[PDB]
Ligand binder design. Structure first.
Ligand SMILES: CO[C@@H]1O[C@H](CO)[C@@H](O[C@@H]2O[C@H](CO)[C@@H](S[C@@H]3O[C@H](CO)[C@@H](O[C@@H]4O[C@H](CO)[C@@H](O)[C@H](O)[C@H]4O)[C@H](O)[C@H]3O)[C@H](O)[C@H]2O)[C@H](O)[C@H]1O
Length: 358
């Protein structure tokens, strides 16, 4: 649409991912692949606020971006993921979310949002783009038969509402997570999804800062596939562009001219999954299209890298209290370390298999 949050801004590069990548490139023995790997630190990624412990880091990133913009004559943009719902990941076998509905989860989550808002408030010269709660609202479309999700529904809705309402007060541009083509892009899921996202947008006051939806976050789908991945049989929306082309008009009819961002950080290699639902450390993934507003679609503001490729999706150690057995499937790279920790072998393949090449 008229106002693309990225136009005219320089994206602040994550220092944490930069540290991980430089350390990783040092361990890659081939010199040429090593320099390819090091250049990944110059590719903008999203910073995940997956716990309250990450909020002080948000503060430093905002302050660093502010000073960088003044130093270089630019306007800076910081990319964040809001990811700390109580009873997080309600349909999963394991979750690493620190908050529970049973232990004041709503109030704890509000305080998490309040601390984030208090940081952002202090740096009005820095633009912020936030992905709102991956693996949350999409469960309320398809997974209400999961008892943990059914019992979490009112909390997910209330907490996402609190995030939208209060981050809007400090001008954050917001994209609600909306799964991917193999989750909500099934034609039969489109209208239920549109009805839910519209109701959430309405509850938060239809703020213009609620720009739309984020798709393929931490997943592996093509934006535009050469041919349908065999995992997609039965779904005519076999890539993200088909999904977005089908969902966007439904939102527009509800009065919400929604735009989209699409994760492609691990989409360089297609046809690597046995089943579409397999999401953990999928073996053979490559870095995909680098972030750009040259998206090829009226509905898509930016291709983005939301999930930082190289950080594990989960351990394959079945004795871990955080073990999700999805991470032991035949198409999951193994052995894999705990979620969020660096997975060096996986990063090296992401670099080697990058498409386009690095
Ligand atoms: C239809 O069923 C659903 O399918 C979707 C896939 O379409 C499943 O979603 C997957 O859910 C997993 C959780 O159950 C998460 S793993 C999750 O990843 C995040 C992102 O890495 C981890 O957290 C933070 O990441 C930061 C950056 O890496 C780190 O700084 C921090 O340390 C990490 O904690 C988190 O710990 C992991 O648990 C998948 O991303 C998602 O695809 C869904 O489960 C099905 O129900």
């Amino acid at each position: 649409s008229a106002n693309n949050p990225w136009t005219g801004f320089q994206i602040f590069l994550s220092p944490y991912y930069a540290n991980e990548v430089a350390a990783a490139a040092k361990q890659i023995t081939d010199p040429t692949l090593s320099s390819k790997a090091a250049s990944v630190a110059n590719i903008p990624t999203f910073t995940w606020l997956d716990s309250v412990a990450k909020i002080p880091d948000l503060g430093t990133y905002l302050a660093s971006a502010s000073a960088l913009g003044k130093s270089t004559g630019t306007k800076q943009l910081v990319q964040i993921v809001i990811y700390d719902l109580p009873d997080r990941d309600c349909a999963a076998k394991a979750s690493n979310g620190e908050f529970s509905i049973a232990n004041n989860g709503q109030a704890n989550y509000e305080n998490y949002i309040d601390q984030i808002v208090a940081q952002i408030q202090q740096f009005p010269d820095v633009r912020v783009v936030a992905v709102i709660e991956p693996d949350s609202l999409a469960n309320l479309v398809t997974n209400l038969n999961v008892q943990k999700c059914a019992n979490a529904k009112t909390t997910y809705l209330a907490s996402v509402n609190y995030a939208l309402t209060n981050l809007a007060k400090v001008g954050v541009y917001m994209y609600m997570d909306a799964g991917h083509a193999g989750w909500l892009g099934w034609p039969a899921n489109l209208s239920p999804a549109a009805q839910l996202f519209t109701q959430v947008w309405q509850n938060a006051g239809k703020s213009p800062f609620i720009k739309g939806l984020a798709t393929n976050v931490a997943n592996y789908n093509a934006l535009q596939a050469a041919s349908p991945d065999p995992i997609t049989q039965g779904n005519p929306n076999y890539d993200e562009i088909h999904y977005i082309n089908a969902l966007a008009p439904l939102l527009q009819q509800a009065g919400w001219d929604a735009t989209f961002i699409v994760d492609q950080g691990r989409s360089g290699v297609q046809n690597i999954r046995q089943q579409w639902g397999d999401w953990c450390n999928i073996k053979g993934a490559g870095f995909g299209t680098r972030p750009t507003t040259n998206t090829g679609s009226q509905f898509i503001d930016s291709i983005v890298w939301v999930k930082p490729g190289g950080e594990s999706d989960g351990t394959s150690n079945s004795s871990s209290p955080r073990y999700d057995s999805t991470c032991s499937l035949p198409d999951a790279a193994q052995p894999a370390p705990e979620a969020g920790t660096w997975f060096q072998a996986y990063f090296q393949t992401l670099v080697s298999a990058a498409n386009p090449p690095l």
